[PDB]
Amino acid sequence: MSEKKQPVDEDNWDDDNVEDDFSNQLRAELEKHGYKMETS
Amino acid sequence: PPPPAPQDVEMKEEAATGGGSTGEADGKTAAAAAEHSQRELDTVTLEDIKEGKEPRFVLRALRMLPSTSRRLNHYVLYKALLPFLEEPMDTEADLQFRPRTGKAASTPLLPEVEAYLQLLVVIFMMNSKRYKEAQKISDDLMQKISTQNRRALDLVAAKCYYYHARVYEFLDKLDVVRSFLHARLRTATLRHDADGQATLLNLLLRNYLHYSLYDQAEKLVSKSVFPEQANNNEWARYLYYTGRIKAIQLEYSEARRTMTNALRKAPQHTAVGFKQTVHKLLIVVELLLGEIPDRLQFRQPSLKRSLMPYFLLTQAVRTGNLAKFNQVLDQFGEKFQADGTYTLIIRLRHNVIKTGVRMISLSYSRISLADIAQKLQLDSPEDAEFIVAKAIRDGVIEASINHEKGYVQSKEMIDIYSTREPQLAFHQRISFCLDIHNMSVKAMRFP
Amino acid sequence: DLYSRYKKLQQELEFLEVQEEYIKDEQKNLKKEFLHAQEEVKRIQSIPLVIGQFL
Amino acid sequence: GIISLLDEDEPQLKEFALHKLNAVVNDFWAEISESVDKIEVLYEDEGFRSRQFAALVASKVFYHLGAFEESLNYALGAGDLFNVNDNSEYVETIIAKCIDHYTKQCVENADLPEGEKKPIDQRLEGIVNKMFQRCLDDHKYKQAIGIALETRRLDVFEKTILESNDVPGMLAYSLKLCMSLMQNKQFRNKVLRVLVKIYMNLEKPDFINVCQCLIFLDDPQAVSDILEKLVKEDNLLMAYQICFDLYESASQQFLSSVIQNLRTDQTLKMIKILSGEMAIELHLQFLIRNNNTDLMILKNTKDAVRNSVCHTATVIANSFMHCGTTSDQFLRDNLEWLARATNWAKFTATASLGVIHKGHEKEALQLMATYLPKDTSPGSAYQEGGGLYALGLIHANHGGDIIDYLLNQLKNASNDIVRHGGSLGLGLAAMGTARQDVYDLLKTNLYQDDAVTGEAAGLALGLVMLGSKNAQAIEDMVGYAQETQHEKILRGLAVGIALVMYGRMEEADALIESLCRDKDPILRRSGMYTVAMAYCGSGNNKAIRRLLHVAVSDVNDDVRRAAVESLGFILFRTPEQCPSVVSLLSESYNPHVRYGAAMALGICCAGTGNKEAINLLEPMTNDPVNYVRQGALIASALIMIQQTEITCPKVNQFRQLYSKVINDKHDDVMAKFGAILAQGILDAGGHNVTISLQSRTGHTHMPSVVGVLVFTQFWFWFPLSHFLSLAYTPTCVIGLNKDLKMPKVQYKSNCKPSTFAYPTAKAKKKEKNPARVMPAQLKVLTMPETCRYQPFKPLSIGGIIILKDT
């Protein structure tokens, strides 16, 4: 349906919220977290 | 062996649809049209879909005494253009069946839009609509016989004014057609309201945000609301255009509700990217809010080739990276300048700071100033007091600065419990509900 | 006849708009009449009813 | 962006600026839309020399918006450019709505007619008469008469007859057009008189002019004007039409108005025209030569002997076919069945001699010289009452000198069993006369201390005071109507105070409320009959609003019945709406509204070839209520008259259906009483005579309004079942030239022989007795172009026209 302007113009995908939350935040998810308890 | 079949069913197109429309339009007023006469939209878009062909149905049109049975059957039998589109006036002037004038000045003429030769017949379509606009002008100077142009041919007329649009666009712009439109408005303002002005007003904004910019303020004095919104499709994209306006008028909190409304009033299908491409620039206003969720709840993978900038852009929104900011800008700023996107590049930083202050504000009752100066990529405590005042900017949640040295003495705000603010609004909630009871009353009034 | 046709279409209109009001009032009336029917017939209650059998 | 140029107060760049204004006025609509204040700055300036074109660009922006009073202001302050610029939709839409402002200005100018009106710009009416000069040069009679009456003003209407070398018909069809649409009488009187003035001073002497204003304007001065002139040029073949129309169309008290103008040969003619014998005896001649009836069906229902009211049904059924025939058969062939019933059938039987020998005016008194009230028997006082009742039928609707002699007989008589017929005949022959002796004995007729004479007193006082606008008689009547002992007294006086005011249209409304206010059912019922009689024949919503409301909301059922009885009384000019509006009224709860609904479709749709009214009376004649089946048979009689056999195929179906219901015994007696009386209605003269609410003149007829409204409720007094027989006109034509001179004229119609056939293609006349015809078989004739005697006045329907002895 040509609306007179617009003709001119769950695999891995629900997780995308968690992943874009976790892009540069806890990128390993455990490999610091399992090793936090001996930092202090 | 296929073309003898539209000789039957393309004949019964005009027989059933057009013959019933004209004959049942001759009486039984306002059931004259609009029970299968304005089946016109999809049955005649379908006529331009369902099926030499160009001279055949345009010869020998106006004959005599109503022998269109034989004449349309001649149009059937003949399958085995310079004066030709004017031949429905050159056989004789039409002289009878004034509901048929625009009907046969639309349905045979318009398939050249779908034939797409664009060179010799768009000026002939211009002439054919000079004839049909002569009908449009001469309905009130020379045709003082009965209504026949409001109740049927106004709903036909706005459609073929969209076809006017289809013709006028494919070569140039239109300026004379705008005062011509407002004259068409004056002969539809007080007598019988048609959309019409809203059709070429959608086109007005559509070519004007391309090329003229004074006219939203002229809409402001021109906002005859037209609450009929019968198709809801024209009204939907009307909200889309004016939501692009309020996005370029930088009105956002209105834009989110009215553009979510404009989306949820699209019942549309056909996932080529109509709803998707209109919806992307719709929720660009949510990119301008300062708040936007993850767009996984919005994507059709047919839009994916166009949103190859857009997903990384909303990643830049949820993050705050200036590298990602400028990189998405220069690299991925193509294909959106055709729609107009560069008002988010000035305030993507504002989007960053409002997302951050939303997270921190609902996260923290009290924060400190010279650590909220280091939550995001802030600059200084004077920049942080600055951005606390700019974080209020409208009336946000209570943040009093502890005005000696305690950085901020902010706390959370209360009394949304269940006390007076919801029952301050429930009068208006049930005001909406009684409006729907008026819809029930008019549901009874439909017969 | 454009002075007399346009005279009398108005006349027959104002006639029928008067004549609508009659039936509007009767529709107001007969719902009350049907409620009076309902309760004043359903006073058929237990005037000291007798026990019997149904066959 | 021109308000920047509007900073300048010198106009020498403002000419360039206004040339910019009408150049980009389609783009910059919101430019002026707040700059209206500076438009008023340049408008109200007395030095800015373009304030008119400032009002035009103001017209542009308020054409973009569409304001009304702004366009009134542009009619004011646009001036020359408001006037000469008229070839555009841009100007004609806003001046079209200004002409709409002018036509509601003319509404204002017709709201109050005596000075002190609202002010008028000479330019808003300058465009009216300027556009009207286009209407004069266009010369179309639409263009004249439309705008001539849109203004509701007689000056430019007077100027419309002054147009060019045409108007062969405006000066003879203008009154026809104006009567065919009129709603208000306040200026109609003046239009109707200013047209007939120039019709008196026309190049042609016309007859439809005073033939119309003599009955819709009823002037004693205009009838003296045509008396004066038509005697003055000393010709009576031209005064033929209008003097015999003076007797034939006009009613009583207008004869009083002309007999004031009589004396100030044609002397013998003015002696004889107010007598008016010739119509009576041509009616008599027509019926004695035109007895196209049947006595066999009268035997087939004569055999149905019962002691009840059936005797009255038989004698009224054969009086219907002998009212004006001077012929009796069931007063002849029997005495035992004739004297079977008692004390009321004797009233009716000596009343049928007056019904049948109505139309035997002078000689019927000596025909009843044997049948005086005190000659036959002093045993039944109703026999001696029906006697003077029949003498009132001798003086039915056109009495003579013996009106006062019946009054002399009513000076001394029995108590009340005489005046029930005597005073009714006295006021029948004395309609609207306002006589003093009737007031004299009607005083003691009120004070009889007997309820059976309420009809006598009330109805006769309403008759002699028809359209009274009295108070003192009405004071006597309604102020006696709170303390009496029965309701026949109340109801005779109630229909009398209905009958005391007629055709008022604004005047009886005080009495309408006065009858409305009381808790007396009979008095509000009288209010409904009064709002009928003051508003007869006109679709006035002021009746139908309160009628509507009282026929819904009240549960008092007599007044509801009167409300659904007044409908055909006020709307018989347009009978073609009554089915759609009394449709569900036929399905009410009571016998009153259902009965009055059947009667409403009956008295409404008389002359209609409708058959929808028939189709809706079908479940009304098969109703569960008994006397609504009776009244539905009577309503079938009402629909089938002013209708022939081929007008609706159920005529013989209703004849055999009447036969079905009456000639069997097991049907309802009360509901089969109407069947043979309805047959008699159906064979009134053998379809010769019928009812006539609407004349060719348009003058409605007092029996066919008054007698039928009294005839409505007939159980309450059984001799109220006679009065519809007084409402009969023979469906026949008079092409007579000299008063007795028989023509040789036999012209034809192009119809069928069976449409002619009443129980070849051409019609055949009879050389005047007149000849019976369908009313609808008079617009389908053809003049004899091969005859020696050719008529000149067009004969579209029955009545009299002029012929020429050539």
Swiss-Prot record, chain B:
Chain positions of cross-link Glycyl lysine isopeptide (Lys-Gly) (interchain with G-Cter in SUMO1): 12
Residue span of region Disordered: 1-43
UniProt keyword list: Isopeptide bond, Phosphoprotein, Proteasome, Ubl conjugation
InterPro entries recorded: 26S_Psome_reg_C, CSN3, PCI_dom, TPR-like_helical_dom_sf, WH_DNA-bd_sf
UniProt-recorded Gene Ontology molecular function terms: enzyme regulator activity
Alphabetical list of Pfam families matching this protein: PCI, Rpn3_C
One annotated Gene Ontology cellular component of this protein: nucleoplasm
Residue list for modification Phosphoserine: 368, 380
One GO BP: regulation of protein catabolic process
Protein's job: Component of the 26S proteasome, a multiprotein complex involved in the ATP-dependent degradation of ubiquitinated proteins. This complex plays a key role in the maintenance of protein homeostasis by removing misfolded or damaged proteins, which could impair cellular functions, and by removing proteins whose functions are no longer required. Therefore, the proteasome participates in numerous cellular processes, including cell cycle progression, apoptosis, or DNA damage repair.
Full protein name: 26S proteasome non-ATPase regulatory subunit 3
Curated annotation (Swiss-Prot), chain C:
Localisation: Cytoplasm; Nucleus
Function: Component of the 26S proteasome, a multiprotein complex involved in the ATP-dependent degradation of ubiquitinated proteins. This complex plays a key role in the maintenance of protein homeostasis by removing misfolded or damaged proteins, which could impair cellular functions, and by removing proteins whose functions are no longer required. Therefore, the proteasome participates in numerous cellular processes, including cell cycle progression, apoptosis, or DNA damage repair.
Family membership: Belongs to the AAA ATPase family.
Quaternary data: Component of the 19S proteasome regulatory particle complex. The 26S proteasome consists of a 20S core particle (CP) and two 19S regulatory subunits (RP). The regulatory particle is made of a lid composed of 9 subunits, a base containing 6 ATPases including PSMC4 and few additional components. Interacts with NR1I3. Interacts with PAAF1. Interacts with TRIM5. Interacts with ZFAND1.
Name of the molecule in the record: 26S proteasome regulatory subunit 6B
Record organism: Homo sapiens
Lineage: Eukaryota, Metazoa, Chordata, Craniata, Vertebrata
Part of the intact protein present: 39 to 93 of 418
Swiss-Prot record, chain D:
PC repeats: 348-381, 386-419, 421-455, 456-490, 492-525, 526-561, 562-594, 596-630, 631-671, 674-706
Highest taxon in the source lineage: Eukaryota
Modified residues (N6-acetyllysine): 665
Pfam families: HEAT_2 (PF13646), PC_rep (PF01851), RPN2_C (PF18004), RPN2_N (PF21505)
Keyword rRNA processing: no
BP-aspect Gene Ontology terms: proteasome-mediated ubiquitin-dependent protein catabolic process; regulation of protein catabolic process
Keywords for the protein's UniProt record, in alphabetical order: Acetylation, Phosphoprotein, Proteasome, Repeat
Molecular-function GO term, any one: ubiquitin protein ligase binding
InterPro entries for this protein: 26S_Psome_Rpn2 (IPR016642), ARM-like (IPR011989), ARM-type_fold (IPR016024), Proteasome/cyclosome_rpt (IPR002015), PSMD1_RPN2_N (IPR048570), RPN2_C (IPR040623)
GO cellular component: azurophil granule lumen; cytosol; extracellular region; membrane; nucleoplasm; nucleus; proteasome accessory complex; proteasome complex
Keyword presence, Acetylation: yes
Family listed: Belongs to the proteasome subunit S1 family.
Known partners and oligomeric status: Component of the 19S proteasome regulatory particle complex. The 26S proteasome consists of a 20S core particle (CP) and two 19S regulatory subunits (RP). The regulatory particle is made of a lid composed of 9 subunits, a base containing 6 ATPases and few additional components including PSMD1. Interacts with ADRM1. Interacts with ZFAND1.
Function text: Component of the 26S proteasome, a multiprotein complex involved in the ATP-dependent degradation of ubiquitinated proteins. This complex plays a key role in the maintenance of protein homeostasis by removing misfolded or damaged proteins, which could impair cellular functions, and by removing proteins whose functions are no longer required. Therefore, the proteasome participates in numerous cellular processes, including cell cycle progression, apoptosis, or DNA damage repair.
This protein's name: 26S proteasome non-ATPase regulatory subunit 1
Primary gene name: PSMD1
